[PDB]
Ligand binder design. Structure first.
Ligand SMILES: Nc1ncnc2c1ncn2[C@@H]1O[C@H](COP(=O)(O)OP(=O)(O)O)[C@@H](O)[C@H]1O
Lengths: 479, 238
């Protein structure tokens, strides 16, 4: 049942896009805020399809009312909500569903005070008491930006989505747009794709039931701390973070998912900035976060770089000697330490060059105990080691060498430098396949949730390029 | 705690279960570390690294290396007002003389008055640039501290039989500087230092070849502390 919901939404927005080219980000975003109870703001020059999107989304319902109003410098509240006789609000805003308000940055002080109460509580005073408003989508467009210290910032800080529209730039998409025959006043939405009033009240409750994975909280909390490190970043209060959770839960709900997906963080690019200066800062930090901490992009770079450094170090170890390192600290006797990641076994064996006659017999390999080698090289004493891997741990005359080696002395005071038996090294290939397998696991999640309708198309060229860059580099060292 | 800390300050963080916050002092290319910028003392900076670093509360103590190992005094007139710390420490282990000269007013923690709600901690060395036996130090107090219970912590590192030969020489350093007969040693050391600075520039141009250079401004005619401005090239601090 949840899988069939993503197909019905994809077909609903298909007819809405027919007639407005290069405006998929301004139409698909308004559908998410209408089915979840959010708002949206537009900005740009008058004439980039800003009022038609408010009159196009009403055809996707069955009981929607349009309201295209233009705020002026001498506008009165009695001409916006309805003149009083108690207020004749027949087809305006208190009983409408989708209202449009253009040039909102020039109304009076009484109009702004009424728009703040119709968003948080969906109520509006009517002389004495208040009443509910069945508003589903709130859209507002303009052209200029408000002041830095004014009373108009109380409404801008409450809106969620801040769309950034612009004129057309592509030449291929302008040919059919210049001579379009699609009418903007008909009903291109079929009668089978329109939702009813019963399905709307049920979807408003199932949004809050979406679980919040632990991996998603690690990216949202990190993004909040990243914005605090930049003094030029816009100030975001706790009210925006509470409404941002509903935006991500509603996006994955209509995409055939039951939990919050990490790909839903792309919609946060239009919910933090406020002007043209902060526009290039919010879209920049999210692009690094999505291509650095979302699918563990940088998490694989800190491990691949260590393999390249380790591959060059093993070139002089894989003829074969054994260099003993000195452990740190202030001690009287010059203590020695074993090898770290090179050897890990407990009863490993050690070879030798010139053979000696120990205990009146020949030997070709001597094995030492890891639990006994760490104590003799630190606390001192005498070491005990068996011969040819058999017998008991007999005592030997082992000492330290000037070139950091293991010289085994016998009854004739002869030297014998010990060494470890040798085997793209095996350690490099073992550590590389584990990192390469993690890239396929992170790419498998991205090769399933990319069909989300609420994702901009221009971001697919940057997220996929970031995953292919690591894959092209991890396959070069294995050549 | 300051980033440019001494070996003694490292063992302090290893014996107390605290969460220190390290700063980022300025530096050049010759290796001479500058000082902590003024942006690290504002109110938007102290609580900035507290929430980012897990397991950290409001800082109740601040250690400032003033001066550093090379000898670079800071500006205490701006730290005592901007830095909102009720326990600001000044590591004055290299300047036991910022009082007996008028070119040091308002440059150290002892110069000025009692800051309301704060206290100045200075551990000036005694057997470094004075005249006393080894194993001697002082603890300056500018405000209100502890003494009854604090004496128990002092006895944890000091034996019950102190060596009076060091104590007699420790107070002697405070008596050798009192009066005009002691103030001539501070001003006399400055006059001999400025004279040595002028002899380097005199033997540099008149010489035929390379010669040593003193890290000093182009104008050293005055007798005071040369400030590090922003329109100079001798300090090289960006
Ligand atoms: N970028 C665009 N692509 C396609 N059609 C557009 C575009 N901009 C405007 N239009 C068309 O112009 C008509 C009027 O748009 P209008 O409401 O004046 O836009 P705005 O509200 O931004 O001034 C609409 O029916 C729309 O189809």
């Amino acid at each position: 049942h949840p899988h069939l919901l993503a197909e019905r939404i994809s077909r609903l927005s298909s007819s809405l896009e027919k007639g407005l080219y290069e405006r998929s980000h301004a139409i698909r975003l308004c559908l998410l805020a209408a089915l979840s109870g959010e708002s949206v703001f537009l900005l740009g020059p008058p004439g980039i399809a800003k009022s038609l999107i408010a009159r196009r989304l009403k055809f996707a319902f069955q009981n929607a009312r349009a309201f295209e109003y233009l705020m002026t410098r001498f506008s009165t509240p009695e001409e916006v909500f309805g003149p009083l006789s108690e207020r004749l609000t027949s087809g305006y805003l208190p009983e409408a569903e989708i209202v449009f308000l253009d040039e909102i940055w020039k109304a009076g002080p009484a109009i702004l005070n009424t728009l703040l109460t119709a968003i948080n509580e969906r109520q509006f005073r009517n002389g004495a008491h208040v009443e509910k408003i069945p508003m589903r989508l709130l859209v507002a467009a303009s052209n200029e930006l408000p002041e830095a210290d004014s009373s108009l910032e109380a409404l801008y800080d409450r809106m969620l989505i801040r769309l950034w529209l612009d004129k057309v730039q592509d030449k291929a998409n302008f040919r059919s747009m210049l001579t379009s025959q699609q009418d903007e006043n008909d009903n291109p939405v079929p009668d089978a794709l329109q939702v009813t009033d019963e399905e709307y009240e049920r979807w408003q409750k199932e949004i809050g039931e979406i679980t919040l994975p632990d991996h998603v909280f690690e990216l949202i909390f990190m993004l909040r701390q990243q914005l605090d490190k930049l003094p030029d970043a816009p100030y975001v209060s706790d009210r925006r973070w509470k409404k941002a959770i509903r935006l991500l839960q509603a996006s994955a709900f209509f995409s055939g998912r039951s939990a919050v997906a990490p790909v839903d963080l792309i919609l946060l690019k239009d919910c933090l900035w406020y002007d043209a200066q902060s526009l290039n800062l919010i879209q920049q930090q999210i692009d690094v976060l999505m291509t650095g901490h979302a699918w563990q992009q940088q998490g694989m770079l800190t491990r691949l770089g260590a393999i390249v450094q380790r591959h060059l170090q093993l070139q002089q170890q894989q003829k074969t000697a054994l260099t003993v390192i000195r452990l740190g600290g202030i001690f009287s006797r010059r203590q020695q330490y074993q090898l770290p990641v090179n050897v890990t076994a407990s009863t490993l064996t050690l070879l030798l060059q010139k053979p000696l006659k120990l205990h009146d017999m020949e030997v070709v390999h001597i094995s030492f105990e890891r639990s006994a080698l760490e104590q003799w090289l630190s606390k001192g004493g005498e070491i005990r080691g068996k011969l040819n891997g058999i017998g008991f741990a007999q005592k030997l005359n082992l000492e330290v060498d000037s070139a950091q080696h293991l010289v085994v002395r016998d009854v004739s005071l002869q030297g014998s430098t010990l060494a470890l038996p040798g085997s793209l090294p095996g350690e490099i290939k073992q550590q590389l396949e584990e990192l390469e397998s993690d890239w396929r696991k992170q790419h498998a999640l991205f090769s399933e949730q990319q069909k989300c309708l609420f994702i901009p198309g221009d971001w697919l060229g940057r997220i996929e390029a970031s995953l292919q860059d690591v894959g092209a580099q991890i396959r070069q060292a294995q050549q | 705690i300051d980033r440019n800390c001494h070996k003694s300050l490292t063992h302090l963080m290893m014996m107390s279960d605290v969460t220190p916050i390290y700063f980022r002092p300025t530096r050049n290319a010759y290796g001479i570390l500058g000082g902590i910028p003024q942006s690290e003392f504002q109110h938007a900076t102290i609580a900035k690294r507290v929430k980012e670093t897990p397991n950290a509360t409001w800082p109740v103590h601040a250690v400032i290396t003033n001066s550093t190992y090379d000898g670079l005094l800071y500006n205490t007139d701006f730290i005592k007002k901007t830095l909102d710390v009720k326990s600001i420490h000044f590591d004055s282990a290299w300047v036991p003389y910022t009082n007996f000269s008028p070119i040091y007013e308002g440059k150290c923690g002892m110069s000025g008055g009692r800051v309301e709600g704060k206290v100045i901690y200075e551990t000036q060395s005694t057997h470094k640039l004075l005249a006393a036996f080894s194993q001697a130090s002082m603890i300056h107090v500018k405000g209100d501290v502890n003494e009854e219970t604090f004496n128990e912590a002092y006895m944890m590192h000091t034996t019950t039989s102190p060596h009076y030969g060091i104590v007699a020489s420790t107070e002697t350093a405070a008596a050798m500087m009192k009066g005009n007969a002691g103030k001539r040693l501070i001003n006399g050391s400055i006059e001999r230092a400025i004279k040595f600075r002028k002899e380097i520039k005199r033997l540099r141009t008149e010489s035929d070849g390379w010669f040593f250079d003193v890290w000093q401004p182009d104008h050293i005619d005055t007798t005071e502390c040369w400030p590090l401005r922003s329109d100079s090239t001798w300090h090289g601090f960006k």
